[PDB]
Amino acid sequence: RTDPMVTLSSILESIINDMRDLPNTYPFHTPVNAKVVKDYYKIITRPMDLQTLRENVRKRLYPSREEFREHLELIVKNSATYNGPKHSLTQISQSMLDLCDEKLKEKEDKLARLEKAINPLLDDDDQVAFSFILDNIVTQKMMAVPDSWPFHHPVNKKFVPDYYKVIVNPMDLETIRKNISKHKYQSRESFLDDVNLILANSVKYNGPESQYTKTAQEIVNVCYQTLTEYDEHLTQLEKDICTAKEAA
Numbered sequence: 001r002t003d004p005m006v007t008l009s010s011i012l013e014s015i016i017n018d019m020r021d022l023p024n025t026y027p028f029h030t031p032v033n034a035k036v037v038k039d040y041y042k043i044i045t046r047p048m049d050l051q052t053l054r055e056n057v058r059k060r061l062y063p064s065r066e067e068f069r070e071h072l073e074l075i076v077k078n079s080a081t082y083n084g085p086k087h088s089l090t091q092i093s094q095s096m097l098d099l100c101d102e103k104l105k106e107k108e109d110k111l112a113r114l115e116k117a118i119n120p121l122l123d124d125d126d127q128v129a130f131s132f133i134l135d136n137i138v139t140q141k142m143m144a145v146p147d148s149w150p151f152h153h154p155v156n157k158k159f160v161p162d163y164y165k166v167i168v169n170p171m172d173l174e175t176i177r178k179n180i181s182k183h184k185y186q187s188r189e190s191f192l193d194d195v196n197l198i199l200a201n202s203v204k205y206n207g208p209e210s211q212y213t214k215t216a217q218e219i220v221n222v223c224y225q226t227l228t229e230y231d232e233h234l235t236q237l238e239k240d241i242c243t244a245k246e247a248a
């Protein structure tokens with residue numbers, strides 16, 4: 001009878017209420033006015049605030065606590081970049097994230113039940129096993145490529161100011177890991193689309209002959225090599241995930 005997305009959304013909104021009530025948080029309650037803070041979008045790529053977060057909850061945009069927390073954490077990350085890692089505003093934003101984490105921990109079993117009702121694949125043992133393997137390929141093989149650090153995380157526009165003018169469809173290994181953690185990939189095909197986007201963006205930003213692109217090529221190649229080594233197992237997992245998906 002009960003729509004678990006409604007129940008989840010009410011929990012998330014309550015957390016937003018609690019974070020809004022923390023001291024000195026008003027600078028985070030609504031979007032930054034980028035006409036008064038005239039350099040804001042030259043530095044920040046993914047703006048976020050509590051009003052936008054709440055509207056997104058009400059748009060039923062967060063099927064689990066992961067997607068919600070990712071957006072909440074942008075508030076902290078943006079403040080660390082724009083104001084500084086130890087600025088009072090960054091400490092204030094971190095106090096909101098800390099409270100969120102306390103509330104999520106209090107409610108973790110309830111949240112897990114709602115999340116699996118919304119998306120039964122989150123509790124499917126073949127999906128979980130498939131995602132586990134992908135994450136290990138990323139951390140033990142792809143991130144182990146020498147000098148692969150430029151590809152481990154999203155580019156910070158503060159440090160590479162023209163990056164997102166050139167690269168409008170960015171991708172990086174942390175984002176892929178976040179996608180794995182959310183069970184975004186049900187087979188290798190979608191995973192390889194994101195992996196190859198890293199390489200394509202290197203060709204575009206750094207050039208096809210750049211050492212950065214040679215490193216990106218090595219990341220892609222070790223991914224192919226490892227997927228091949230695990231092909232028989234991965235194929236069975238993919239088949240069983242498909243079956244579970246048809247059933248859900």
Ligand SMILES: C[C@@H]1COCCN1c1cc(C2([S@](C)(N)O)CC2)nc(-c2ccnc3[nH]ccc23)n1
Nearest residue numbers: 149150151152153154155156159160205206212
């Ligand atoms: C532009 C280069 C090459 O293509 C891939 C992305 N690349 C990055 C990525 C990063 C990040 S980061 C610190 N989160 O922004 C993700 C790790 N950083 C710097 C960088 C930053 C400052 N000076 C630099 N000099 C040369 C590179 C460079 N390049």
